[PDB]
Structure 1
Amino acid sequence: MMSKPVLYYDDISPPVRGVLLTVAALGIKDQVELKLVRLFEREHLLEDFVKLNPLHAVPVLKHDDLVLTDSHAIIMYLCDIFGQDGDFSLKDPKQRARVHNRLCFNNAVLFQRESIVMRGLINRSIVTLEDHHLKPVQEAYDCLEVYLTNSKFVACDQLTVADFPIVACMSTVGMVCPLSTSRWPKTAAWFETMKQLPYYQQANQVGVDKLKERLHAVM
């Protein structure tokens, strides 16, 4: 009779996969109900979903009357109510701020730059990738490489929920802007490490593979 959060989702979306990765890492796959909202079917444009989220985007989390409409806020909230006593705890204010700071980096920099390119490719706004498209992504790689020089994972020396949105993005934009282990060695090593998490395949690779298939169709 506990209230279960409901995650409105399409796992081709990197923001969605950041949450899926988080749900698995926190061990709460059984406490979060899923509700599929298929982007290529345009189910995010249905009147109910637009009423739920005027941004008409996934993911969305509904928990009782709480409606979160950004993967990054969903991730922090799931940590608060399910991860306070574990390895992903955000109880310490400086630790919470370190993690939040890198969530902001993903939301405002890395995913923004990935989505300009990916949205243009999907809607056929771009047919050929020019340097104007990939240079901002490589600048984001440069920043990530600095972060992963200063700590072992994106926000500190331990894995945190901030690694999950960034790796969801990294594994997506990587198909059009591949990581060079020589130019970004700390980032490549971190990427390889994250792919080895036991839940990486079901929480992130499935969705990447579906998007790769959609991109092969449009290119």
Structure 2
Amino acid sequence: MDFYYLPGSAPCRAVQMTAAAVGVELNLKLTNLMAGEHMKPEFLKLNPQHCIPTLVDEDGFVLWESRAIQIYLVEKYGAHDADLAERLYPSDPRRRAVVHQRLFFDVAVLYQRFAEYYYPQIFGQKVPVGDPGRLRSMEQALEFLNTFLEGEQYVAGGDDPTIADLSILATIATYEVAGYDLRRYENVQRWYERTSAIVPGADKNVEGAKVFGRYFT
């Protein structure tokens, strides 16, 4: 199925790992925000929010917002292997709630603060590194994540990585290329290495993350 994306994009990488986890092959279509590919006719026609990534199902069904896509992929494509779906997206209300919680934490907090701190330094006007307030706020998000991982192998608990691990795995890999020292958070560091070593597509994650590093030189 059609996947409009960009390698350095964390959300896109999140979807890439998830697709690999469920055995779906994505028809990669590089949506270089050049010429305003997202503000383009055909595209805006699919996603009026012109945000990336954007998925177009066989029936032309259009979906964007990585995390929503991740769930979609599992529910519609991973479910053939009930053991898998349950591993990546636990059906128990309590377990799933924690997964959802982490997914929301990832968008609204973990990546949000990452961007709010770095985007001003790498884009637009390119600010001379830093804004202490945003740095602490960003580090606070890492402290949170570190706590979530206290005595846990995976971000949302459980015995196997979930959709949440992949999502946050994408975000955190971006933190690394950004040059932040994750060693400063034992659990995150530990989880990162470990998870990156057993997850499907971890390779495209790291590779795409590296691409994003292009901005941090």
TM range (shorter): 0.7 to 0.9
CA contact (8 A) 1:153 1:190 kept: yes
Correspondence 1:163 to 2:159: no
State the shift of 1:25 in Å. 1.9
State the shift of 1:74 in Å. 0.2
SS at 1:174's partner residue? helix
State the shift of 1:66 in Å. 2.7
After TM superposition, list the pairs within 5 Å mapping 1:1-219 onto structure 2: 5-29=1-25, 32-40=26-34, 42-63=36-57, 64-84=59-79, 85-89=82-86, 90=89, 91-120=91-120, 121-157=122-158, 158-176=160-178, 178-181=180-183, 183-197=184-198, 199-216=200-217
Which runs of 5 or more residues in structure 1 are unaligned?
A: none
The separation in 2 between residues aligned to 1:41 and 1:127, in whole angstroms, is 28
The more displaced of 70-79 and 42-51 is 42-51
> Greater helix percent: which structure?
2
SS at 1:61's partner residue? strand
State TM-score, norm by structure 1: 0.85
Q: Classify 1:131/1:200 alpha carbon distance in 2 versus 1 (closer, same or farther; 3 Å).
A: farther
Let me know the Cα RMSD of the aligned residues. Answer: 2.1
CA contact (8 A) 1:194 1:200 kept: no
CA contact (8 A) 1:109 1:140 kept: yes
Q: Residues 173-204 of structure 1: CA distance to partner in whole angstroms, max 9, x if unpaired? A: 233462343x4111110011122136445321
CA contact (8 A) 2:145 2:188 kept: yes
Q: Which amino acid aligns with 2:92?
A: D
Identical aligned residues as a percent: 31
CA contact (8 A) 2:16 2:201 kept: no
State TM-score, norm by structure 2: 0.86
The more displaced of 131-140 and 190-199 is 190-199
Q: Which amino acid aligns with 1:10?
A: L
Q: Which amino acid aligns with 1:14?
A: A
Q: Classify 1:142/1:24 alpha carbon distance in 2 versus 1 (closer, same or farther; 3 Å).
A: same
Which runs of 5 or more residues in structure 2 are unaligned?
A: none
The more displaced of 204-213 and 120-129 is 120-129
The more displaced of 154-163 and 52-61 is 52-61
